[PDB]
Design a binder for these strands. Structure first.
Ligand SMILES: [Mg+2]
Ligand SMILES: [Mg+2]
Ligand SMILES: [Mg+2]
Ligand SMILES: [Mg+2]
Ligand SMILES: [Zn+2]
Ligand SMILES: [Zn+2]
Lengths: 576, 576
RNA sequence: GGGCCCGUGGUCUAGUUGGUCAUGACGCCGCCCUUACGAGGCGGAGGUCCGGGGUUCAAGUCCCCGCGGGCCCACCA
RNA sequence: GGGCCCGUGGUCUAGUUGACGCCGCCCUUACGAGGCGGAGGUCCGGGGUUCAAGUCCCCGCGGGCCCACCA
């Protein structure tokens, strides 16, 4: 009983709405790991700060006498004075470092119900990296079994943590076994050793391998990752949740955090921040004060950056610049740049979830910029249109491109050293632009659903509304020069394009509304064209392939088929 | 009457100590342009904030009745309640926009003495960009004349503004004419139109052309540049001062500033900041309030980032990562990336001022990282060593390098995707390392000054102190694997290296001290090997080439010969 | 369906003639500046303003109707 | 000439219950980097404290920061 819906999206990640026991939050989001005995910062304020969710170690409490009781006494919220979403850890992380931990998967799994938590974790086994073969195999099974045993003894939302070591094949498997099982969240675990050793590439090989085999709808949390240096990369991998003692742990050893890396106080002459701590202090005066005060103020600051970067990321996603932000943070350190270069290698993975159009332009600002999904796509997607229509124009990013396409995303919406001069149509070809924009936007074929049409030009010279006889097939949206279908056009297309091309099939229950014009909700989608990508102009149909309406996709096809909460299409017009 | 000394340095820029009228400040540093009549934020606060210096438009004053008087009345500081360094503008900028401004170069150059300012600017003429030819020539002469007329009627420190339009040939000339003239500061002007049109390339072409022909000792200020997006770039070009109404001007139009570019309030979902305004508010909430309060808060914010980035930069310089921060900010926007790629093209300009060793390692984080000065040099500088000594090992950044060099900056102090495994010497080789580190560090030759020596190995296996018979020629400094000369060694060298190889020539006056071991001050250097680069291990000598001491250069050779304030060498041992 | 915005390629506005509002937008030719790309600078000429209807001596510009586009809230049936 | 620090490759420590060197297995395209177990050298040089010292204070020989003098 955990709700998850994709609010906005970019890259392969997304900003979502998460609901557990009435308490809502929004992802991406990081959970500050807190060890109750000795709290550097009390939930009291974390909450006051912005953290509407955190995490503690249940197992560490099960051991302590005092808390065990205070626990079963006033729940956990009350015992931490935290009125936000609280989640716990099995203590497997403790089983990784110190090895032997005393408790049964069941004992703790149960112990978590009594303490009245909001989300819990069964005792998964975090095998380390480069671990021997069988040790990964055998250990994963034990994990999978404890995951089954926990599947049916559970009553609260639970984390099904994907283990598998440095073995992408295992990761892949333990991913489908756990995706098909009935759990609410999937954290990718046993990576801290990697992160501490800045093995950002191996981490991505892992996070990718997994996000591929997991169900799109369940939240992915990267276990033990709380440094601003990874968020942008991570999030664009389709990660949504982070947890880490990083902030306090760092602060203790006198380390300062920057989205670009780590700084040793006794190496700071200035404060590369503007938060409340670096505002009223200095590296000199803060190096003066003693531990108790020094680490507290550091942790404090660390939290502020952590928080800040996260907002930074979300903002990037909201604008459609997540990749530029990764390309920027990638420069923060060699090992991470490596990783980024590697992420960009998994085209197929990223392509699937990469929006078809964004709000802000494509920016050529690195060699890597040219390997970004949205580029590769358009280069191939435009290949055919170029030959059929021809009349090419030079492009700073794609080299050559048919003028007919020259005003639609990402061709006209790109910026690079040298500038791209677009070419407005001329009455006589105004159509070929549409035909092109159509075969490009809808697929080898679409052209025909517009064969004979009329293209109006605005006071600028831009191809806008296309209509036949008296009614409009579609409109060349100003922003990105793509086509927004207008019912009549939808129909005209549906006829020219074979099924399942660009279609969404809604259950009988929903069929009524679609016809009217009301939006479609993920839950009611029986199946939809796989090649559907976010913000695609799509055809709503009934199980019998009868046009029901046209709108704007909000999820990849494969995505609507599995989401239960959230909207699938933002219906423009209804067939009735 | 204005002092300027290079505190710390990197790239081609540096953090310096600037003193005018007893009031100290530190560069890089930005001065908020303020228009008295309607002040969005009063100096009162600006100073409270961190701005120990600002600027206003004297010509704007001379026109207004009220102010002209209040001006001649209680000076300027008092009229602005500002107790920091105040500087003014001639109004030429107003001569550019609106064209015709009423006043004589003399009239206002004198009106600036009366109002009792700390720094002033004569009426230079800011020719725009791509302006006709003569219009640039003719106009620059008028500027240079006004600069002569003001050279002799001046009593207060003044800004010698380099004009010249988009003509690098004129820029370079107008730079020598004004470098040789008696002025305190040189702003590079008539660039705003460039900056507003994000022509970051053209700006570099200009800033570079000029920094080349200007005297190293006089501070360079980039007229009208106040956006975080340029600082790292600019500063690494050897700029030291900025001024801009940017913050209030943007805030007015509802634009928010981020090190990476500009954001339109009504496009913000979150606040990618941690300052005092983005902390206690939200994009939603701030969009609600009206102008009076919206603009003020934004301006306020803008100031916070501005300040922030500047610190960022200085920190960068202090650790020796200025370039990494440019490589990062370069990704902020296409046109800027271009510019950066271009700056990196002038190797000879940058190499001269490029530290011989830095505190933090070299980072391979982009294709551009491989064109950074520090690498090109090393690859060439290492060329011969590799042939002579041989026994090469592969390197992630330089491909191949002889082991004997493998522990010396920046080979062992480099980080890139794949890692470099160093090679500690073996007693029998121990020396070849030094010999190598020698010919590499000092020049084709130096090897001999160590021909027969003893290399001690630490508890690590690292070659550290080298001595012959009983005394130490030098030591293999731990952090960078370079040689720190020990007087005996210095003379050993001096003898095998022809003049002026790595020599610093001191005025008779200073010859005394040198011998003792006290540091050398720029002022008393008659001449020094040009191939001298900061943090180079050098030989101090007297006008007749007698070894007087060994130290640590702090300026490129050609730099010592010109600097009056500031120290030239950090003397280690004296010959006496 | 409920609210607000719009008639639109993108990029972007930094040495504040007091703040602010104008001084159209597009397209057409020439000189400059450019390695030509680019991006600017200067001067010429005078066409068009998605459709329909009013208002005014004057209408891209001011309401009004239509055909369109974006954001937000509501419907998870 | 003072005051502080150190005896040193870089990088780096994010689901909070001494060092360098030597051989083998695992994980790695070998690189990288790790994970496991065997082995047990030397720890700038001299003098001490100790049953025991790289480890603790003393002197030597060295590196680093800050502050002072622009003569
Ligand atoms: Mg579904
Ligand atoms: Mg001199
Ligand atoms: Mg909506
Ligand atoms: Mg000093
Ligand atoms: Zn901070
Ligand atoms: Zn802010």
């Amino acid at each position: 009983m955990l709700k998850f819906e994709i609010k906005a999206r970019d890259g392969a990640g997304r900003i979502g709405k998460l609901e557990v026991n009435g308490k809502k939050i929004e992802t991406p989001a990081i959970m500050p790991v807190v060890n109750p005995k000795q709290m550097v910062v009390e939930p009291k304020e974390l909450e006051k700060m912005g953290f509407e969710i955190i995490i503690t170690n249940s197992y560490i409490i099960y051991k302590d006498e005092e808390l065990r009781r205070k626990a079963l006494e006033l729940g956990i919220h009350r015992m931490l004075d935290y009125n936000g979403i609280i989640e716990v850890d099995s203590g497997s992380f403790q089983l990784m470092k110190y090895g032997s931990i005393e408790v049964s998967n069941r004992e703790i799994i149960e112990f978590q119900h009594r303490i009245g938590v909001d989300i819990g974790t069964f005792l998964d086994i975090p095998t380390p990296p480069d671990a021997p073969r069988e040790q990964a195999v055998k250990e994963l099974e034990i994990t999978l079994s404890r995951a089954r045993e926990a599947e049916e003894i559970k009553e609260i939302p639970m984390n099904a943590t994907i283990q598998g070591s440095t073995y992408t094949d295992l990761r892949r498997y333990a991913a489908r076994r756990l995706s098909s099982m009935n759990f609410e969240i999937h954290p990718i675990g046993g990576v801290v050793p990697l992160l501490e050793s800045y093995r950002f590439r191996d981490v991505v090989d892992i996070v990718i391998s997994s996000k591929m085999a997991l169900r799109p709808d369940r939240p992915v949390h990267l276990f033990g990752a709380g440094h601003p240096i990874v968020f942008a990369l991570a999030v664009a991998m389709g990660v949504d949740l982070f947890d880490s003692a990083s902030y306090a742990l760092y602060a203790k050893d006198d380390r300062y955090m920057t989205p670009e890396g780590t700084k040793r106080l006794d190496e700071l002459d200035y404060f590369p921040c503007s938060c409340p701590v670096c505002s009223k202090y200095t590296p000199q005066e803060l190096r003066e004060m003693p531990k108790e005060e020094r680490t507290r103020l550091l942790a404090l600051h660390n939290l502020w950056v952590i928080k800040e970067e996260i907002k930074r990321v979300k903002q990037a996603i909201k604008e459609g610049e997540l990749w530029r932000l990764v390309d920027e943070r990638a420069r923060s350190h060699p090992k991470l740049y490596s990783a980024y270069k590697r992420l960009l290698e998994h085209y197929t993975f990223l392509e699937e979830f990469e929006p078809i159009t964004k709000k802000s332009a494509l920016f050529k600002i690195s060699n890597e910029s040219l390997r970004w999904p949205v580029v590769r796509r358009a280069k191939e997607r435009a290949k055919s249109i170029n030959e059929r229509f021809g009349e090419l124009v030079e492009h700073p990013i794609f080299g050559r491109v048919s003028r007919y396409l020259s005003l639609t995303y990402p061709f006209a919406q790109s910026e690079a050293e040298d500038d791209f001069k677009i070419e407005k149509p001329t009455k006589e070809d105004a159509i070929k632009y549409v035909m092109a924009i159509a075969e490009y936007q809808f697929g080898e074929g679409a052209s025909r659903a517009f064969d004979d049409a009329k293209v109006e030009l605005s006071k600028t010279g831009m191809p806008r509304q296309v209509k036949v006889n008296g009614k409009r097939l579609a409109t060349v949206r100003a922003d990105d020069g793509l086509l927004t279908l207008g019912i009549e056009g939808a129909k005209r297309l549906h006829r020219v394009l074979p099924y399942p091309r660009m279609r969404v099939v809604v259950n009988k229950e929903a069929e009524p509304f679609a016809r009217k014009g009301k939006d479609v909700f993920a839950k009611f989608v029986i199946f939809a064209d796989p090649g559907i990508r976010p913000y695609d102009e799509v055809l709503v149909v009934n199980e019998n392939d009868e046009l029901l309406a046209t709108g704007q996709a909000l999820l990849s096809g494969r995505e609507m088929i599995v989401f239960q909460y959230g909207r699938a299409v933002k219906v423009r017009k209804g067939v009735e």
